[PDB]
Amino acid sequence: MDIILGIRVQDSVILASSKAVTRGISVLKDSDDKTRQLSPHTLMSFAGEAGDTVQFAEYIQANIQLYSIREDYELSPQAVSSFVRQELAKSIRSRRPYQVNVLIGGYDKKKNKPELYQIDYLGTKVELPYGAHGYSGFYTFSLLDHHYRPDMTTEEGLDLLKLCVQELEKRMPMDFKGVIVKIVDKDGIRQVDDF
């Protein structure tokens, strides 16, 4: 785990997530996908405690997919984010809490608007034009404060994201083995293969 970023532009939400899985003094994998598709137009990235992350992600995925089948309908990004927040808000006062931080990127088809939600393990939710979890934010937030405009295209958003990854690869202590980038828009979720 470690690096997960998100940028909301004019027509889409872009999520970038590090590929490395490190345990001790060994990078066990360099192609790890730290994301789950919750619904056709909603994607969730995650970072935190080993085991907890995937277990929580897949548990949420199962619940949203269950909802989709029951109602023959896709929950709004706002509704999914509220469901996830409440699960983490319950979790924090459990015997053993889920130590997982998430970003939720979705395209609301009823509003025709991209939406990005940042939720931490305590259940602290905020809607943002750009987001980050962990130490990443200490570099990317100020960078995006400067270069981000609300009316940018998806291509402009990807260039803005390249600028973030470059900065992290320069100043971060650990080798996070690059990122997997995914775009969420009106046509659903797709992966950029050459980043």
Partner 1 sequence: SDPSSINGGIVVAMTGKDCVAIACDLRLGSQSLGVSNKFEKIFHYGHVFLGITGLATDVTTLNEMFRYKTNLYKLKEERAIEPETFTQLVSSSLYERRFGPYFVGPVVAGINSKSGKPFIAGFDLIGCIDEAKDFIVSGTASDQLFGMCESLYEPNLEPEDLFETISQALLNAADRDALSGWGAVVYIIKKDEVVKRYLKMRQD
Partner 2 sequence: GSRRYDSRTTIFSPEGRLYQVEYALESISHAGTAIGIMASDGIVLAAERKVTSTLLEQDTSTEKLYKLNDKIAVAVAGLTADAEILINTARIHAQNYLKTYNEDIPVEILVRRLSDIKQGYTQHGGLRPFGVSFIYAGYDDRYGYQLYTSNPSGNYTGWKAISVGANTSAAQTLLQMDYKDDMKVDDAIELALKTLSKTTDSSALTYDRLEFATIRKGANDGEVYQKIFKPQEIKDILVKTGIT
Q: Which residues bind partner 1 (CB under 8 A)?
A: 85-86, 88-89, 92-93, 118, 120, 122-128, 137-138, 141
Q: Judged by CB under 8 A, which stretch of 6-14, 29-37, 82-90, 154-162 contacts partner 2?
A: 82-90
CB of 5 to partner 1, least distance (A): 13
Nearest to 106 by CA among 188, 47, 34: 188
Which is nearer to partner 2, 8 or 125 (by Cβ)? 125
- What does 89 bind: partner 2, partner 1, none (CB cut-off 5 to 8 Å by kind)? partner 1
The answer to whether residue 73 forms part of the interface with partner 2 (CB under 8 A) is: yes
> Which residue has 């970023």 as its token pair?
5
- What does 110 bind: partner 1, partner 2, none (CB cut-off 5 to 8 Å by kind)? partner 2
Burial per residue of 127-153, b for 16 or more beta-carbon CB atoms within 10 angstroms, e otherwise: ebebbbbeebeebbbebbeeebeeebe
- What does 170 bind: partner 1, partner 2, none (CB cut-off 5 to 8 Å by kind)? none
- What does 185 bind: partner 1, partner 2, none (CB cut-off 5 to 8 Å by kind)? none
The answer to whether residue 110 forms part of the interface with partner 2 (CB under 8 A) is: yes
Which is nearer to partner 2, 89 or 143 (by Cβ)? 89
Cα separation, 69 vs 89, whole angstroms: 26
Structure tokens, 64 = 């949203």
Task: Report CA 145 to chain centroid distance, whole Å.
Answer: 19
Which is nearer to partner 2, 2 or 74 (by Cβ)? 74
Is residue 32 exposed (0-12), middle (13-18) or buried (19+ Cβ within 10 Å)? middle
> Which residue has 């400067």 as its token pair?
146
Residues in Cβ contact with 71 at an 8 Å cutoff, skipping those fewer than 6 apart: none
Residues that bind partner 2 (CB under 8 A): 71, 73, 75-76, 78-79, 82-83, 86, 110
